[PDB]
């Protein structure tokens, strides 16, 4: 996001915030749900 | 980090920044630092908290 100040935050900024925050939270949740549905409590995934 | 992605375009001032005793990293260096977090001891440390 280049040259997008506060007054310019628009569709593209929302899509980037989705990518970089909300879908990373969703991917973490998906991994959790997959390991819980299989009873995996002793092989945690490290999130960098 | 100097190189591409988002931090490129700033490579011409990296030397000026480093003149203040700061360190800028190449992508290999930053990758080495990040892979340092996947070492067995850091993994256990993350499992603790």
């Amino acid at each position: 996001e280049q040259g997008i100040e506060l007054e310019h935050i628009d569709s593209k900024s929302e899509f980037a915030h989705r990518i970089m925050l909300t879908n990373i939270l969703r991917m973490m949740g998906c991994v959790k749900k997959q390991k819980s549905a299989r009873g995996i409590e002793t092989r945690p995934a490290q999130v960098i | 980090t100097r190189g591409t992605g988002l931090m490129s375009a700033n490579n011409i001032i990296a030397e000026g920044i480093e003149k203040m005793g700061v360190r800028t990293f190449s992508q290999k260096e930053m990758a080495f630092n990040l892979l340092g977090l996947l070492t067995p001891e850091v993994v256990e440390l993350c499992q603790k908290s």
Partner: protein, 64 residues
């Protein structure tokens, strides 16, 4: 499940060919300890590969 990290019912029902036990986290470390404490005094340790750096162990077979 609490002591050795596997369910006997799962083995009886599905007959897996291989089973890996993972030692991540506190619970995993406790299970690893239970695995390491086993001996065959006659004092050889059973599971001689398991040590304080093992992250997992794998029971293996051919048919089940």
């Amino acid at each position: 499940k609490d002591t050795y990290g596997f369910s006997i019912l799962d083995i009886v029902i599905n007959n897996p060919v291989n089973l890996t036990i993972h030692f991540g986290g506190e619970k995993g470390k406790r299970i690893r300890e239970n695995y390491s404490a086993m001996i065959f005094e006659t004092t050889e340790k059973i599971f001689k590969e398991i040590n304080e750096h093992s992250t997992s162990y794998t029971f293996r077979s051919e048919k089940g």
